[PDB]
Design a binder for this molecule. Structure first.
Ligand code: NA
Ligand code: NA
Lengths: 39, 50, 151, 151
């Protein structure tokens, strides 16, 4: 239970989690806006 | 200290246009207005990545 | 790689690989702006032919050819389309030209699509391409001496 | 040659001949990339009208005009062509527009031809032309003083 907090504690993985979650936000926003937008 | 910067202001701007897009969508006669405000809002969320 | 031995074409072939960082920056800024423009004009006017490869075409492949001088006007402008009641939903519609722009296009707020076309051509044609010529001129004048020592 | 005597148009006519090494480099890199792109899109989609000057046209003369903004889209893309059983061989086919693009075009893996068009426009209209402006700016700032002493 040491290398778990070693990998996930570094700032590159907090940044990488930020970018991956933010691109999935834009993909969700695009799927809502383009494909299924019921009136 | 929040208001002084420009990307705290810009992310504030993307969320205020989001609230305006929802509140214009939920009224029954203003559907196409919210349909266009969310499109301009998607531009402001994607200029976040810079 | 065969002609790096030559006297005149030698160092100029060696230099080209040291310019690829600025092309990668340009692809970064272009893909951010290509998504931003593309989904906005796709949402504002919503076509009726909504297959997955068709909307990927008219999001990523119209604007990429727009920066090289290929601008389709008849596919996103009411004043160049013929109107008609071609849909079965509330609102006004139009009928575009070409088998890829969908069958119907909403007429609502089409002046805003004309403005997004103007802002796209400004940022892409003038802001990015002329900045890219600036970064190639600076990098080439900086690494020319080291690439002759290396060659 | 008559107007090299003049005071203002003098040295600027003398300089132009000392720039011809960089144009020769550009013709080198363009002809390598023009062959590489051209035979690949010619092999991927094989037309049925196979005269020798016709395939030399649609290998060397389409892409050379593509770097100057003349892009034919209706001659190499299924979604802009009308399909049909216009051949007598195994597979799916299409029918292009224009008397020079052949009579039939294979529909197999036409997304790869769209990708070779994108990679060609990237390397030609962005890498090579903006690198060529970089080499003219460096050479001109280097030989301007010697060409005034010579003039
Ligand atoms: Na043009
Ligand atoms: Na042009």
């Amino acid at each position: 239970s040491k290398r778990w907090s070693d990998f996930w504690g570094a700032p590159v993985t907090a940044f990488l989690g930020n970018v991956v979650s933010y691109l999935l936000f834009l993909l969700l926003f695009a799927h809502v806006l383009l494909v299924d937008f019921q009136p | 200290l929040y208001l002084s910067d420009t990307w705290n202001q810009c992310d504030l701007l993307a969320l205020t246009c989001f609230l305006l897009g929802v509140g214009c969508r939920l009224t029954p006669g203003l559907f196409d207005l919210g349909r266009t405000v969310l499109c301009l809002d998607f531009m402001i969320f994607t200029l976040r990545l810079l | 790689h065969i002609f790096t031995v030559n006297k005149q074409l030698g160092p100029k072939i060696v230099i080209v690989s040291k310019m690829m960082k600025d092309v990668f920056f340009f692809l970064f800024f272009l893909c951010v702006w290509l998504v931003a423009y593309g989904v906005a004009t796709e949402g504002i006017l919503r076509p009726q032919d909504r297959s997955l490869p068709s909307i990927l075409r008219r999001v990523f492949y119209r604007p990429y050819l727009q920066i090289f001088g290929q601008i389709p006007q008849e596919e996103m402008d009411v004043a160049l389309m013929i109107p008609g009641n071609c849909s079965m939903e509330r609102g006004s519609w139009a009928h575009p030209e070409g088998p890829v722009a969908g069958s119907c296009v909403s007429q609502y707020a089409n002046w805003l699509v004309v403005l997004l076309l103007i802002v796209f051509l400004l940022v892409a044609n003038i802001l990015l391409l002329n900045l890219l010529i600036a970064m190639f001129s600076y990098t080439f004048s900086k690494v020319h001496g080291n690439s002759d020592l290396y060659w």
